[PDB]
Amino acid sequence: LLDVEATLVALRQQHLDRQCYFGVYVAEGTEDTLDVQMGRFMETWADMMPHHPHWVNEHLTILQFIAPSNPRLRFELNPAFDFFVAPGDVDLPGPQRPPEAMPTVNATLRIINGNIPVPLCPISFRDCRGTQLGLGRHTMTPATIKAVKDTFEDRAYPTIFYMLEAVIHGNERNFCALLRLLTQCIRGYWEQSHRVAFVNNFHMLMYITTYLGNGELPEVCINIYRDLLQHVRALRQTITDFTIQGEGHNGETSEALNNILTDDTFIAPILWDCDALIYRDEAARDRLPAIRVSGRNGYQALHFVDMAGHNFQRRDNVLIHGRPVIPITPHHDREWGILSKIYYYIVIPAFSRGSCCTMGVRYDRLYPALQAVIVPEIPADEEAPTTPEDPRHPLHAHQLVPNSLNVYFHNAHLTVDGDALLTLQELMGDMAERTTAILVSSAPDAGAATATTRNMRIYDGALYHGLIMMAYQAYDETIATGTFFYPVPVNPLFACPEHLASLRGMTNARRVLAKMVPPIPPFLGANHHATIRQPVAYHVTHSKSDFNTLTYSLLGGYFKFTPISLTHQLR
Amino acid sequence: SHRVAFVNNFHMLMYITTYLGNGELPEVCINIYRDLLQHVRALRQTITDFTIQGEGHNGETSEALNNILTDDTFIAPILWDCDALIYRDEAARDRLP
Amino acid sequence: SRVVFDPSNPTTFSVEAIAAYTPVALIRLLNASGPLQPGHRVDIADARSIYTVGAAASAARARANHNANTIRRTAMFAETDPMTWLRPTVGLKRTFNPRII
Amino acid sequence: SRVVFDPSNPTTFSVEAIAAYTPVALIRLLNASGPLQPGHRVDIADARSIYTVGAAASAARARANHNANTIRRTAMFAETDPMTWLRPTVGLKRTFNPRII
What we know:
Chains C, D: This is Small capsomere-interacting protein. This is part of a larger assembly, with 2 copies of chain A and 2 copies of chain C (101 residues). Chain A has helices at residues 5-13, 35-47, 62-66, 123-133, 142-153, 159-168, 172-175, 179-193, 202-211, 221-241, 254-258, 275-283, 335-352, 363-370, 405-412, 418-427, 508-516, 534-542, 548-557, 565-569; strands at 81-87, 103-109, 270-271, 290-292, 301-302, 318-319, 357-361, 436-442, 458-464, 467-469, 485-487.
């Protein structure tokens, strides 16, 4: 199945000319923050597209794909490989601009069986396989389904939640300290529209279930969170069930030998602590790994950062938010990563349906905004007011001044006391410098690692201290567009054709150009070299069957296509 | 009377959802408005779904070359601002207006 | 004085002195008989508009009186700040009561 | 004194002396006209960060004033105890009110 040397030779023999090497080229970072690189990528990818890509038209039926007019027909030879054309005599990654060279034929590997083009593997078959997988497994209740659907589809999500999650950056010493404000804000947001909040970050709902899991919240939101967690656990259990146990090669055992969601070499799209990188480098240790963190190769992890010395401008420095209880140590356990991968790659796409995006934050602009508190002095031997109608309350007009935090909270229409707002000063202990990008690369797994596939290499990008926005709206003039966030999406799945309006210097030409092809910078990964590819994105954005069935079909599609994983699946 | 109002103008329900979308109104009227907006967005998405993307002539894009609701030369029956006229004069620039 | 019978009499100069409620009472009690001999050859509807800007000025006086207890209003939109470089700027939803004390 | 017009004037040395609410009111009334002749050639955004650490100090001052009635907080996690051998240790959920008397 992996003797493609002769076929590649024969393809290179014949003369073929082609241009538009956008989705096949990978670059590196020039140590800018995110924005100069984003603008440069915008201008380049605008003026460097001579023709249209051939991997984007996946709407064709089987008849059209078979018809001899199909240009990409001659390259569909092996079901486990992808034959494309790329500029030859170049090394990946390389410079920022692709040097001019003669185009040659290159062939990557289809790691996932779901990467097969939709014209060959239809959507109805995937949905039927998913409903065959989910025979009697755990399902979700229509109440929770409707609630999370409304939360995902709502455009009135207050930016105060994004700001709070950003300043928390996923740390227990922050969560447990701000627990007083969080329960109040959650209950207030819920008892206005019957909607559950804080579904962006994975490291929020487990904290909710573990801490506020005794009756602080009403019996409904805790039940919704428990249902979501139970669905994730049932998915993981199914991954365990549908493979044979009792064998493991030099690398990982049957589990990540068969699937990807249980693989440590794979990383989540959002990183908050550096334990995943430790797990990644310590898991494989055989396939030659490489990490690019904004320039120099190799990351430098350090403990918590004080308030005085923050150094918003830095290079090759990653935080871990100290420790809740000298070398670095992993924060959480190993299955935490598996749960995060399952969540982010199944439940978020199945509900957002290609509407969510991922963006970066600006702490240099966020922190000066949150240091405006106008909580009033309480008289001695007196009680604090609870309702905001009296002037003593922080949410009163007597204490409402422009460009403060109380105006933010009033625009959000919430009710908070004083100690919760005061806890922000203790939150100011730990800090967040900036969000950054990571480009990891490794050889194929030992299941399909032969004498020629080792030369092939996979490339995927990820964000550190990033953000996931559900539904961006450019019709909110209460806050300037791009005041704290800027889109930097790197995925065929998490792409956002509309969130780009928040980026500075956007034209109608760029808008309609990005409306067709998903904008991904080359220094963050190419489509033909990444793991998740366009077929799965098209499937998740065009399939309309259900939510449970969609999740199970995506799970079934997330499977390897190696001659070893086949020994598990066929058995 | 259990009835929603301000349905004559299109520049009223968008403002309602953008501003009174936190809980100022009961959970029924805001839900009605959100449902209407969702239906509009669904029709808009259907228009894109029923056409082939990736080609455009000297005029507008595939969307307007195929359908009319996505065309800028066409104008709404009621206008409150003159941005539609700017968009119309800028979009075609070929057919003698 | 403001006598709408002779159209040369009513003007915004005098309406400012008149209160907000009294002109409504004034117009109601005046008779329909208007002397046709006096009349504005200057598009009498201007006197109608003159009556509008006069009523707007009378309403402006009543608000200034009411503003004794109201709260000063601010900008309801962003991007309006002298030095936005220090910190960002947000609007304000006018959902309060002007009652202070 | 803290005068944001001349960028050399505002420093955290003076912001600590200023209160919590008055600087917000202070920045509000200051005009947009900033003298372009004086200016920090030292990454003026450091003066922004200087403005942040100064505001943190002012907030710390107001917090210390509020702590007169606040209850002393403890550790919310286990494993943090001088002599764990005598008896185990647990955290504490901060779901109380600082009001004492």
